[PDB]
Design a protein around this ligand. Structure first.
Ligand SMILES: Cc1cc2nc3c(=O)[nH]c(=O)nc-3n(C[C@H](O)[C@H](O)[C@H](O)COP(=O)(O)O)c2cc1C
Ligand SMILES: Cc1cc2nc3c(=O)[nH]c(=O)nc-3n(C[C@H](O)[C@H](O)[C@H](O)COP(=O)(O)O)c2cc1C
Ligand SMILES: CCOC(=O)/C(=N\O)C(C)=O
Ligand SMILES: CCOC(=O)/C(=N\O)C(C)=O
Lengths: 360, 365
C-alpha cells in the first residue's frame, strides 16, 4: 500500500503518508491550550498517522479567528505546547504546527456559536487588519483596517517570533497559513488586495508579503526541519486557469526561497464562488502544482476514504494525503485505513495495548 | 433507539446504554497509572459512552495480573486516578472502576510479551495466592500457595481499602472482579477450590469469600452509587446446567446483599473448555440471569456492533451493553453507533469541536 510507505523530508521520517491537517478546535482561552487539546492530539497521534499538524495558531492576539483560537504570541503560550509536542512524538508521529493570522476574518464567533463577526467594541471582539479596508461580506461584514508599512513589518516579525517559539517547543515541522482567505491569502488575491503600493497590484507586489514572511521565517527555522506552507491555488471565481497559473509561479518562488512542501488548498477569499461540494476534486490540481513547480505536495477535502487516499498516491498527485474530519470522527482512522487496504499486521498501526487484541 | 436511552441506577444516571467494560492496558509501572491511561480513558469518554469502567485495578501488589497492571493499594495510587475520574466526568460519561485480585493467574507476562507465567528465575515475578495450591495449567503453570485464614482477612480488607480509595477519588460506580478465573471466581469454582475449611467444600462455603467481600465493601461504598460485580456464570466445561443454576442462586444472594447490577461473563477458571464464540452468544445467558435473579445485567463478548447492541436491549436480554474491543479500535465508537442507528443529531454524541462538523445535514448539504 502506497499509503503506508514511509516518507523522508529533511531530517524527518514519517512512518506513513497519512497526515492530519491543521483543524481548529476553538477550545483555547486567551490563546492558551489546555486538556481539550492534550487528549485530542495525543489520541489522534496514537491512531497511527505519520504527521500531525496542530491547528492554526495565531502569531498575534488579533490574528486569532475566534476567542477560542490557540496562540503562540508569548513564551508562556509556547511552553503550553510542549506536552502536546511530546505526546505526539511519544506516539511515533511527527509533531507539526500551522502558524497563522486570520486577517479580515478575525474576531468571529465559534462556528457552533453563530460563526459570525463580533464587533470590536464587544468585550469579546477586537479590531481586524488586512491589506485593504474591504470586508469579506456575508456573515463577516466588519471592514478591516488597511495595514501600514509598519503593520506589515510588525506582523512579519510576529511570524518570525512564532516560528522560533515553535522550534523551541520541539515542533519538527512548520506550516505557514497562507490559505483560506486569512491574512496571507488576502494579500495574494486581487479580490481583497486593492493596494497600489509595493504590496498590491502586480503579481510581484501581491506575492511580496508572502515571500517576505517566508524569507524572514527561514532565517530562524532550522534547515534540517521541513519548512512548509498552505496556500489556496484557485478560488472557483471564474478565473481559475489564470489564478492557478499565478499560484504555480508563486510555488516556484516558494521553492527558490527554501520551501520543502506545499499544502495545496482553495482560496476561500470571498463568498461569491462556486467551489465543488464533493470529494477529491483537488487531486488533479495538486498534481499540476507538484509537477509544474517540482515540489512535494499534500492536499485535502474528501480524501478521507482509504481507497481514495491510496489512489491519489498511486497516481502521484500527492506525496502525503491529509485526512481531517475522518480523524475527528475516529481518532484511530489510520488503523481503519490499514485494515481496509489489507496492510500486513494492520493492527500494529496502533500501540501494543490495542494492536495485540485487534490482530486479524 | 434503545441504545441511546438513559439509564438510572441508585442516584447515578448514564446518558445512554453503552458501557465500556474494564480493559487492562498493561502500561502502569509499580501500579501507578500514567499518560497512557489519561489519554486512553479521556478519549473514549469523549467518544460518547455513558459509562466507562476503568480496567482491573489490583487491591494488592501480588493481585496484579502482570508488572504493567494498575493498582490502588495506597493513597498515592488512588490520587493518580483523580485526573482520569475528572476527565471522564468532564466528557459527560460516568467513571467506574473494577477492583481486582488476579489470584493464581497473577505474576504473568504482558499479552504481547508471551502472555505466560513469569518464570522462577525472572526477578520480575512474585509468588501467587489462591484458595488451593493448584495451577490453572496451560500457559499459566505456576502453582499458587493456598491462602491462610489471615490471608483471607487481609485480602478482604484490601478490597475494602480499595473501594474506599475509589470512592474518595471520585468514582461513581464500582465493580468487584469476581470473574475470569481470578481470585474471587476461583473461590467459587470446584475446579480450583479444594479447601475443607469454612471457605470450601459446599455451595455456602465456596460462596463465602465472595459474599463476605461484597458485605465488607458495602460498609464503605456509598449507598447512592451502584455497587456491582462481574461474575462468570458458567465455564463451558460440560457442567453448564448445574453451574448456571448455582451461579444464579449466588446472584440472588448478591442481590440480597445489596448488589445493584451484575456483569454476566464466563468463568475462564480452567483451560479445558469449549466456549461457543459467536455474535452476541452471551445474550440468552445474560437474559436468564437477569430474569431468574431479578437483577439488572450487562454482558460482552460479541455485542460490539450497533445492531447487535440495539437488539440485545430490544430483546430484553441486557440493561447496558458492554462494548470493549470496538472502543480500542475506535475510541468514538458510541458516535459511530449513533450514526449507524440513525439517531437524531447523532454527531452531538461527541463534544462540540467534533459534533459541529460531523452533523449529517452539514455533511450532506
Ligand atoms: C474543525 C476544522 C478545523 C479546521 N481548521 C483549519 C485550520 O486550522 N487550518 C487550516 O489550514 N485548515 C483548517 N481546516 C481545513 C482542514 O485542514 C481540511 O482541509 C478540511 O477538513 C478538508 O479535509 P477533510 O475532507 O479530510 O476533512 C479545518 C477543518 C475543520 C473541519
Ligand atoms: C485488552 C483487553 C483487556 C481486558 N481486561 C479486562 C479487565 O481488566 N477486566 C475484565 O473483567 N475483563 C477484561 N477484558 C474483557 C472485556 O471487558 C470484554 O469482556 C471483552 O473485550 C469482550 O467484549 P467485546 O467483544 O466487546 O470486546 C479485557 C479485554 C480486552 C480486549
Ligand atoms: C474553509 C477554509 O477555512 C478553513 O479551512 C479554516 N482554517 O483554515 C477553518 C478554521 O475553518
Ligand atoms: C479472558 C478472561 O479474562 C479477562 O477478560 C481479563 N480480565 O478480566 C483479561 C485481563 O484478560
Amino acid at each position: 500500500s502506497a499509503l503506508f510507505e514511509p516518507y523522508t523530508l529533511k531530517d524527518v521520517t514519517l512512518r506513513n503518508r497519512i497526515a492530519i491537517p491543521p483543524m481548529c478546535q476553538f477550545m483555547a482561552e486567551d490563546g492558551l491550550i489546555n486538556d481539550w487539546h492534550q487528549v485530542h492530539y495525543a489520541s489522534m497521534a496514537r491512531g497511527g498517522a505519520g504527521l500531525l499538524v496542530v491547528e492554526a495558531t495565531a502569531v498575534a492576539p488579533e490574528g486569532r479567528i475566534t476567542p477560542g483560537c490557540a496562540g503562540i504570541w508569548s513564551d508562556a503560550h509556547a511552553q503550553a505546547f510542549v506536552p502536546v509536542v511530546q505526546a505526539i512524538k511519544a506516539a511515533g508521529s511527527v509533531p507539526g504546527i500551522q502558524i497563522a493570522h486570520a486577517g479580515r476574518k478575525a474576531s468571529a464567533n465559534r462556528p457552533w456559536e453563530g460563526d459570525d463577526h463580533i464587533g470590536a467594541d464587544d468585550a469579546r471582539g477586537w479590531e481586524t487588519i488586512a491589506p485593504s479596508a474591504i470586508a469579506f461580506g456575508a456573515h463577516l461584514p466588519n471592514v478591516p483596517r488597511a495595514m501600514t508599512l509598519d503593520d506589515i513589518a510588525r506582523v512579519k516579525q510576529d511570524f518570525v517570533d512564532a516560528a522560533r517559539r515553535a522550534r523551541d517547543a520541539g515542533f519538527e515541522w512548520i506550516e505557514l497559513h497562507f490559505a483560506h482567505g486569512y491574512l496571507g491569502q488576502s494579500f495574494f488575491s486581487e479580490h481583497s488586495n486593492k493596494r497600489t503600493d509595493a504590496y498590491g497590484g502586480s503579481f510581484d507586489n501581491r506575492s511580496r508579503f508572502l515571500l517576505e514572511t517566508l524569507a524572514a521565517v527561514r532565517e530562524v527555522w532550522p534547515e534540517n526541519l521541513p519548512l512548509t506552507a498552505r496556500f489556496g491555488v484557485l478560488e472557483y471565481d471564474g478565473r481559475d486557469e489564470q489564478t492557478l497559473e499565478e499560484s504555480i509561479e508563486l510555488a516556484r518562488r516558494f521553492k527558490a526561497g527554501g520551501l520543502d512542501l506545499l499544502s495545496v488548498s482553495v482560496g476561500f477569499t470571498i463568498p461569491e464562488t462556486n467551489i465543488p461540494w464533493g470529494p477529491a476534486f483537488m487531486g488533479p490540481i495538486a498534481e499540476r502544482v507538484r509537477r509544474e513547480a517540482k515540489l512535494p505536495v499534500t492536499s485535502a477535502w474528501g480524501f478521507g476514504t482509504p481507497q481514495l487516499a491510496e489512489a491519489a498516491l498511486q497516481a502521484n498527485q500527492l506525496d502525503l494525503v491529509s485526512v481531517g474530519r475522518a480523524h475527528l470522527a475516529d481518532p484511530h482512522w489510520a488503523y481503519f485505513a490499514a485494515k481496509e487496504l489489507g496492510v500486513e499486521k494492520a493492527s500494529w498501526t496502533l500501540p501494543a495495548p490495542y494492536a495485540h487484541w485487534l490482530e486479524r
